[PDB]
């Protein structure tokens, strides 16, 4: 199927999605781990972020402070440069003035020193005196000439003195400037050394600060480590809280179903509890129905006691009125029981016994149906096919069943409507009571007709041929369909709804059908005279009941004062005829077979003319009943609008009788009076003759039981057909076995032939080659004998040479021994014969 | 198709799995959203952190500079107010130096004036000396002093030259030592400046390190704030995990009651439904009593109709006898005719239907009997023969019939004797009431056992083989004989004569019969687990009823005041064991198959171990019931002569209990106390285990496949053969022709084989004769050969013996020759030595 392939594709698709989304949840949990890492990092960057915000603010504030304090230091320094300007400008006058004063003093001092040198220079300027001096002579003046040369050398030296004095002054000035620059440099060196020591202290402070900050970072790393291990714990707990929340939701959902389920169970327990409150009242109210039917069984039993005491007392009063043969008249042969009482227990016992009986009967019915099914399983389809032997059996059952149903309806209808011989005198025949009685009588009449027809069927099928039996059986469906009119009537009786409003169309149709079918297929079957006559009596009695009821109704329809009218006389005559025919029926019934009383024959037999007379009697009875019923129906329609004290005119009833008689008898212009009178006269004469013949024993006969019924003949044929083919199967099995054994025997004994036949060939050849082989072992053995004899002769000469050689050796040895003895003697003799010279 | 439904179920399962892990995925992806904005704003706060670290670094730079600058501005102001002081001093003593230099210049001015006066004086004196020497001309002795002054001045001037040359060189020595003190101090200042610069660089590096460490400290101060964030969160989450786990536990716990309460509600519901089914069994029993009292009203109403017809007939006879005696007229009065005119009419409207139903059922029974007689007529003789298929069908019918009769009797007996669960507390258990209850309980127990056995029979025969079916059918007369034990009991119930005096041996004895016949012919047929369990429950309940009744009777038999004895509280223990086992039976019955209620399986299936356990349970039940019944019977006819106020001693009841316990349990010297208690413990344990396994569905199964009953196959076969048996005849004709041909072929090569065998025997006559002739001309030859061979061998020892003798005979001769030779040699030597004279 294509749908299977589509479902398989969707299964694979869903399985693949389940792989992918499981793998994705695994990835997606790992990715949640990345969430929690990012959360730690975000809290770290946020904490550093806020701390950073005031760190930046604090650095800005410190920068504000440091720059403000630097600017204030600069402002102080600047107002203070102003004070510098004042004092320094005052200095540079004062040094200008001191410097002019010092330069003036130094100029005056150099002029003082040059003037002292000029005083000495003038003492040497006495050198000028040379000119006056050497012009005078030679002793003192010319001596002063050399004096003056020395004096000029002096003047020469003095100038160099002055020059180096000036140079020394310059050097002194430079000296002072140098040493007081040096004082400045010492101050600078001291300041720089102090600044170096301050920088060393500040470096030591910063450097201790680095160490202390490292220590603080270590403690705060303890805090970070504290954070990380707190966070690991916290993430585990978050996962667990989340999972527990989900589980809590699931459990809440289960608990909520369980709460409806308990509520529904509680509602059902409440419903069962007032169902038990119902049912205790139902057991009490069915038990009140039980004590009520047990009070009805009570009162039925107190009234079977009251009818038992009443029947006992009426029997004792009757037996007292009969024991009255003598004056005594005083004997009640029964002790009075009381009321319900022992009878109570009798009926509770009988109800218990009847309950047991009904359970047993239900069990029997179920058993019969089961046995029925099991048996049906065993006989073949040819039996069960439509129109087969089963349908014929069903027909044989159908007629007794139909007869029984018709009898049940007839008896119940007679009892319910109190159909009695005196129905014509019942009050209220003009109204609904008359219609009810007419309906009941007609129903009983129709049922009697049906029963007679079915009795004919039963007899004919008990004695017909097998062919007719099968033909009737083939009609079983159609002629079983008509039972279901009678079933309708029985259902109406069961519901107490059988009344004059009931439609009897189907029953009449069924009767006509059965009569017609009998006329077609069973017409020349013989009839049973005994219960042909019994059925005739029953039919006649039912027809007479109908006739009497209709006569009474028609009399009630007549207007008062018309009793001397011609129709009223006819009605009275019909009533008298009814009584007479009923008396004849009773007379015939007394001699009817069935009881082992003296004078009653075992059976009846009469000729075909008696049967024809009975048919004619039935036809006339049917005509009279039909006429009366039609007239009464029309008259009832006419009388309905009339008052109770008003009646119909004889003219109207006469017209109705004219019409009905013409329609039913078929004879135009025949008076209904003398049609009906003729029919009744024929009936009276016929029953009178029949009653006389019966009383005289003219019809007495010995009783003709049916030959083996066609069903038994057919069953014997079917069993024979089954058997001498059922045994054929066993025969076939045996012939199977025989055939297998036989052809097995064929190969076995054929290949026994083949073996024997090879053996023939072999030992024919063996006989021939046995002649051959006998010859050739004879030659073998006889060659062997020759060879052995040849050895014997061989060995015999060899023996003989060996004998001869050994004997020669023995002879030679004996001769040699004798020769040695001779030689011994001869040597001894030669010794003494050699000494004697010749 | 099966596969489409399986695929749809798998699709549904896949879909639910995807939806569950999609919802877990969805929670996870909400958390992933949480991640994914956490990552966005981690990058945002990280850009922010890095950017503002840049800004902080710039601020740190600026603040370093500003501290630098404030320090330098303060130092400049301080040096500069040092300079204010220095400048004020310079002003003051520049003014003072101006005044000193002024009077110094004035003093030198006075000196200049005096020296210019002396220069004028010397010029005048030189002019005077000029005039004097111009006057003198001739001169003497005045040229000496000036000469001396002029060497002394040449020397003085050269010495003063050298003198303040030395002074200039000393000033330059001081000035050079000074200047090199400059240069050393400037180098010292340069070195201190270099040290200061290096210190300042190192301090700058240290300050950078300090700022970075301070910032680390900042981040980790934030970390401390997380430490206490996370600590609080972690405590709260631990508490929340604990609370969520507790809520999970609470929800699980009242889910657990909700399940238990649902089970208790179902149990109470079924007890209410058992009470509703005994209210409805009282409705069905009060019905069958209303139906029984209504067909009893129908029979009594037919009886009052017969009594009414008889009383009307007797009243008509008495009234014609009263025709001459009395006739009534009566004034106005309204006593209705007969106490039940419309009471009988109402019971007629109602159970007139019941009378009709009785008649219809009777004719249905007659029709069924006739129908199955007619059908039997068509059945072959092989079917109807003793041991045939008919007997097998009759077995299949007999044994459901037996079951139905069986609890008809059980069901009536329970009602009649009011066998209830509380029979142990009924008054009068010591007397006839106890005996009646014991009889009723035992009867119900036996009937339950019989029903269980027959149920096994029904199940086995529905599924056995045809062969087993056939021998079981062959035993039909024998098992059908046992039915009228039950028929006798139904007699007794119908007559209300079923009491404790009834002999139940035929029933027990039929039960034992059926128990073999099953053990022999149906032993390895499979059992129906469901209705095995159902029968076990029913049997156990009946046994418990017997059990309780006997316990109550034994308690009633005990002496007053012996309630504390071992036997009395053993009896109490047995009573509680009964109650517990009954509760387990109810539990099991609740989930038992048979109703279309949810949770009830279609069928039950359990292994052979469970079946064996059930058998053991039944065995122990039987033992305990038998012991109690035997003890109670013996005690009852020990207590009969005792007064109502007197009781049995515990010694007597114990001694009876010991006797019964041995000869039922078969174990000598075992205390009845352990035996009974152990049996009850086994029952309770097993029965509780079964209830539990039943309650969690361990035995649930579908109904097994229906497979054709042996009767069906047989029936089919029987009917089948009937059909094919037509064609079998044609086959038999063919097989017969084959057999005739096979036999003919067998005969021909039958006497071909015989002919070959004869020829074989004849030809190997020929060989044997030919062989014999050959053999005894052959024998004749090797007789000669054997004789020659024997001669050759014989004639060969004779040579060997002889020629050994010849060898010895030569060999003696050589010895004699040797002796003569050494005699000859001795004589020869004497001849030679005698020939040389000495």
Author numbering:
A (entry chain B), B (entry chain A): 214 to 1051
According to the publication:
Cytoplasmic dynein is a microtubule motor vital for cellular organization and division. It functions as a ~4 MDa complex containing its cofactor dynactin and a cargo-specific coiled-coil adaptor. The formation of dynein-dynactin-adaptor (DDA) complexes is a key regulatory step in dynein activation. Here, we determine the cryo-electron microscopy structure of dynein-dynactin on microtubules with LIS1 and the lysosomal adaptor JIP3.
Previous work showed CC1A and CC1B fold back on each other in isolated dynactin. We used AlphaFold2 together with previously published cryo-EM maps and crosslinking data to generate a model of the autoinhibited form of p150. We find that the ICD is docked onto CC1B in this model but is detached and connected to it by only a flexible linker in the open p150. In the inhibited p150 the ICD blocks dynein motor binding to CC1B, showing an unanticipated role for the ICD in p150 autoinhibition. The model further shows that the previously identified hairpin, formed by CC1A binding to CC1B, is incompatible with LIS1-N binding. In contrast, the DIC-N binding sites are partially accessible. Comparison of the two p150 states suggests that DIC-N binding destabilizes the autoinhibited p150 as one DIC-N copy partially clashes with the ICD whereas the other would displace CC1A. This implies DIC-N binding opens up CC1A/B to allow CC1B to bind LIS1 and the dynein motor. Comparison of p150’s inhibited and open conformations shows dynactin autoinhibition involves the previously identified CC1A/B hairpin and an additional interaction involving p150’s ICD domain. Both CC1A and ICD need to detach for CC1B to bind dynein’s motor and LIS1.
